[PDB]
Amino acid sequence: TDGERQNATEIRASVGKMIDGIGRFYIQMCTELKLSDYEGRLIQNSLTIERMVLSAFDERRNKYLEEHPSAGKDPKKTGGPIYRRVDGKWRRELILYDKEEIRRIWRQANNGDDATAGLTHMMIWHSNLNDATYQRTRALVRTGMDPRMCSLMQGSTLPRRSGAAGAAVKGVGTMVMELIRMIKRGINDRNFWRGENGRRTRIAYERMCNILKGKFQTAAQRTMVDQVRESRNPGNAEFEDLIFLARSALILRGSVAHKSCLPACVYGSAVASGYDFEREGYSLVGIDPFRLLQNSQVYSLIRPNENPAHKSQLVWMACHSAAFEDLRVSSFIRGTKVVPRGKLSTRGVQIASNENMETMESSTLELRSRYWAIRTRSGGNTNTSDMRTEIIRLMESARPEDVSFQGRGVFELSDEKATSPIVPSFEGSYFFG
């Protein structure tokens, strides 16, 4: 590092203040919903609260709902399931809040500031949970992409309203999906790329293709994506080139940011415990999330005949965005063997409406890791016919044995300054296999 330490501390202060805003907003909403400590630590209650906040600030959807009211749902109220424990058993109740009220509470929590960064953080946490839980092979096959490249679908469920953080965290496969959807839309109707809407669509196409270009690593991919962007009315050839680019990302990996976006319950508990994230600072890639997870208790609803350990592992991988990570390193860091998706005896965290909340129980989630490591936004050792041939040569030269991140290991929770790394010595390796 260098004199950029001051810049590195201002960013820490800003992210700490956003975490403080999230936590104290959760505290205020828990007080306004009359939830006890146990219910306030429920992951489903936190998910519902977060979804209500995100729905309250959705400008486009709210405007459309206002202009086209839904069936029996007024466009000025939000809500979701609230799980409250009475006489030992759980019970769900649908709550309804005015969206102006939710926006006012959120603004008051952040000292009268909009703070869209906090909303983006909550959305990224939701996207990480969805990526760690569900496979969207249906959207892959519908768009023509191979369902085998599910490892490139990082941040696929993120809405467009996410800012630069959403673009940074979303993977190459999702960018290819968005571009291919635009290609198909232009193929269906030729009035696309033409007129006043043509300008806006071309601008959006330009911008998404530019940031996909910035996402790649090697020069050949970075030039083929530029060739794809240059075509004014792209057709099947550009779609095929994008397919090839996505396929090449499995070996020539692209740089995708990974951040530890925790559920709002953890931040609320930390703020209630007296932690000042504004003073101490925060970092989504450092020890700060791992340390916070170590000292926090979070409860979750367990469906009948389900394993709490599997659900805790799922929630942990969602928290650390380790859905597509190598299983060996995930198990090494966590200290408990991480079971692939096929052998997880658990369904999604969110509980459907058509469920009987009388055979359901709550289990404490073990969000503890034996070691901690720094999350990276980098790929690995990545060292129109001409570009395709060059890329095929590069992929053929690569092997699944080259060692990447040489000299970088895993640290202990006591090693806050990352002084002494532990290089692992190395079973299954794919989660979604």
């Binding site: 599910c150 597509f324 990570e325 390193v329 990276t376 690995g380 970088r408 290089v423 296999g433």
Partner: peptide
């Protein structure tokens, strides 16, 4: 049967980044 074929390295840890080479290169 389809499934995950590559690995995306979220953690900065000395690794080998596995991928299923015969199936990926079979497409060309």
């Amino acid at each position: 049967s389809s499934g995950q074929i590559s690995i995306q390295p979220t953690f900065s840890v000395q690794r080998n980044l596995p991928f299923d080479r015969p199936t990926i290169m079979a497409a060309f």
